[PDB]
Structure formats: C-alpha cells, structure tokens
C-alpha cells in the first residue's frame with residue numbers, strides 16, 4: 001500500500017450567524033455553487049482531509065461533529081475520523097481525515113488566540129490545528145477578525161497577534177512563528193474585510209453583483225488592497241474570487257443583501273463584502289494548487305454564505321535510511337557561499353544565523369557575521385564562506401531535494417530573531433553553486449533579505 005506524494009485538502013469557512021444549519025449542507029463539501037467549482041465527476045471522490053472553520057457557531061462540538069461526519073458519509077460512503085476539534089467561544093475548527101490516514105497523522109496540536117483588550121477582548125480571535133502527515137507539516141488557522149468597514153487596521157493587528165501567539169507546530173522551531181512552521185499553512189475564516197465604497201453606492205454594488213461583474217468591487221476589497229500594500233498576509237496566496245460577496249444576506253433566501261444600518265448592527269452599514277476567505281502559504285517549490293474556491297448558493301440559515309476551497313498539496317513520506325534518522329549520512333552536505341543578510345534595522349549589534357530543518361539532527365548556530373553599511377542606508381551582515389557545513393541525516397536525493405532550511409538571523413546581544421525565512425533544497429543541480437534567496441520577516445512583517453549561494457551534495 002504505497003504512501004501518497006499528493007493529497008487533497010478541503011477548507012471550509014462559514015459564519016453561521018448563531019443559527020443552526022439547514023438539514024442538508026452537502027453542497028459545501030462538494031464545492032458547488034458560485035465561483036471556481038468542483039467537477040460533478042469528482043463528487044464521490046473523498047478529499048483526504050477536510051478542515052471546517054466556523055464562526056458564530058451555536059452548536060456544541062458533538063452536534064456539529066454529527067452533522068459533519070454524516071454529511072461526508074452521505075457524499076462519499078466513507079466514515080471519516082476526527083483528527084482534532086478546537087473551539088474558542090463560537091469560533092471552531094474541525095479536522096476530519098479518511099480512515100486510511102489515521103496512522104499517517106501525528107503530532108496533533110491545537111491552540112487559540114483571543115484578540116483585542118478589555119472592550120475588544122471577548123469574542124474575536126482564532127483557533128488552529130497542526131499535525132504531521134507523514135513527512136509533511138500542515139497548519140490550519142480559522143480566524144474571526146474584528147468587524148466593521150472602518151476597522152481594517154484592527155483586522156491587520158488581529159492578524160499579527162494571531163500569527164505571533166498561536167502556538168502550533170514544532171516548539172523546537174523557537175524563532176519561527178506559524179508563517180514558517182509548516183510545509184503548507186491554510187488561513188481562513190471570517191476575516192471581515194469589506195468592499196470600501198461609499199454607503200450611497202449600496203444599490204450600485206448590488207446591481208454589479210446581479211450582473212456578476214465583480215472587478216470594480218474587488219478593486220476596493222480591503223483584504224486585496226491591504227495585501228497589495230504589504231499591510232497584512234505578506235507572502236500568502238489567495239485564488240481569484242469569482243463568486244458573489246458572501247455577506248450580508250437576508251436569511252432564508254440569497255436574493256437580498258441586507259446592508260442598511262440597524263440598531264442590531266450598531267447603526268453600521270454592511271455593504272456587500274467578501275468577508276469569508278481562504279488563503280495559504282506553502283514552502284518554496286512545494287506543489288500546491290487550488291482546485292476550487294467558491295461559495296454555496298443553497299445554504300441560507302446565516303447572513304453569510306459558506307465558502308469552500310480545495311487544494312492539491314504535495315506530501316512526502318516518513319523517510320528511513322540505514323544511516324539517519326539517528327545519525328548523519330556523510331554522503332550528504334549543505335554549503336553556503338557568499339551569503340549576506342540585508343536588514344532594515346537601525347540597530348548595531350552583531351548577528352548570527354540559526355539553520356533549522358527536520359533534515360538536521362538539531363539546529364545549527366553560525367558564527368557572527370561582519371556588519372557593513374549598504375549604499376542606501378541598510379545594514380548588510382556578511383557571512384562570506386564562514387557558514388557551518390550542514391550535515392543532513394539522510395543523503396538520498398529523493399529525500400534531501402524535498403527538504404527546506406529555515407533561517408533566523410539573531411542578535412548576539414539579545415538572542416532575539418530579527419528575521420526569519422526559508423530556503424528550498426529543490427535545486428536545479430547538485431554539487432553546483434546556485435543562487436538562493438528568501439525574504440526575511442519578523443512578526444510576519446518584512447525586515448530584510450537573505451541571499452547567497454548553496455552547494456548541495458547528495459549520494460547521487
């Protein structure tokens with residue numbers, strides 16, 4: 001029974017509006033409705049993993065698990081196994097997997113982050129799950145961010161708090177936040193970013209939606225504009241949106257957007273918006289392809305419509321050789337030539353690097369770099385040919401070329417990371433000097449760059 005090199009993952013996000021779901025929600029899991037939808041010929045083919053995020057979820061965990069599992073069993077005739085379930089207030093994540101995957105899944109972590117302070121602490125935040133699927137680390141975040149058209153900056157702040165404080169994945173990756181801990185990270189939820197057009201334009205927006213003309217609306221979508229200005233979700237991907245705004249509907253139909261200010265909305269307008277989103281970030285040169293991204297049309301208990309996204313994701317096997325795990329394989333090495341970090345910091349400490357990778361027995365600390373001044377004000381930290389030779393556990397190129405090296409540049413004075421990034425070992429050649437590059441971030445914001453050359457020796 002061979003190990004897979006690809007799986008498919010279903011991501012759902014649905015703000016349930018504190019109402020129980022209708023009796024049938026199968027269209028969600030089938031990726032049917034509006035947008036990039038799944039072919040009918042696939043309807044009986046189960047996804048490998050289903051990850052369901054809800055917000056304003058009024059159900060108990062038990063109640064929702066019974067609906068989800070019976071939904072999937074009706075579609076696929078498979079009884080899915082529960083990998084994890086975690087709830088913060090009314091924000092919930094469920095991970096279900098095909099039974100054949102039970103002994104491929106391990107290291108399951110759950111966590112939550114509560115956003116805001118005093119006033120603004122008590123219903124927004126995020127839940128998440130991570131696990132290993134054979135050799136591949138997977139992370140999933142369902143966030144319910146701050147509401148209201150004039151709170152995009154708060155949403156951006158919520159995002160940074162969640163990625164700083166959500167404690168998922170391998171705790172030994174201490175310099176790295178969730179945006180670096182996983183082969184594949186999926187972040188979804190009621191992100192609550194709005195279409196930023198004047199209130200007076202509400203009926204014009206509705207007209208555009210009825211004509212399926214989204215271009216002039218998407219050009220004002222706050223998540224797309226904040227991401228283009230590098231204010232949020234730096235280095236994440238999102239499929240093109242080709243479905244109608246998923247908020248705010250009159251319940252029990254989809255024929256009406258309810259946008260006008262009401263006491264129940266705090267006298268705020270809710271112009272039609274793409275509140276409900278799925279984004280991802282995968283390590284460089286790992287296969288990930290979005291195969292659906294859309295909304296359902298026939299689930300109408302909430303003022304939001306459910307959103308679905310599906311992905312092909314590359315996975316790797318739990319590799320064993322005669323040498324590693326449990327020792328190094330002297331026929332493998334990773335060398336760095338002519339490396340330097342360019343940092344945005346105004347500070348003047350010495351810096352050193354740490355290399356972290358599950359291809360190493362443990363992380364590797366470099367010597368301190370040599371600081372120089374860049375021509376446009378920058379700090380340049382030069383490592384030259386001084387970086388330690390990395391000793392992978394396994395030399396087989398079928399393993400090593402699928403690996404990644406995480407890099408943190410740390411202050412000698414504080415041991416605090418000033419920047420994190422990731423280098424793929426999926427090189428064009430071995431035993432050949434090749435350019436490498438990663439942006440460096442800290443708390444998910446850009447702080448610099450790391451570039452140089454790599455020379456990878458495998459057993460071939």
Ligand SMILES: CCCC(=O)Nc1cccnc1Cl
Pocket residue numbers: 081082083084085097101102103105106108
């Ligand atoms: C609800 C948690 C039950 C559980 O232990 N799930 C699990 C763990 C490891 C691998 N696969 C699965 Cl389904």
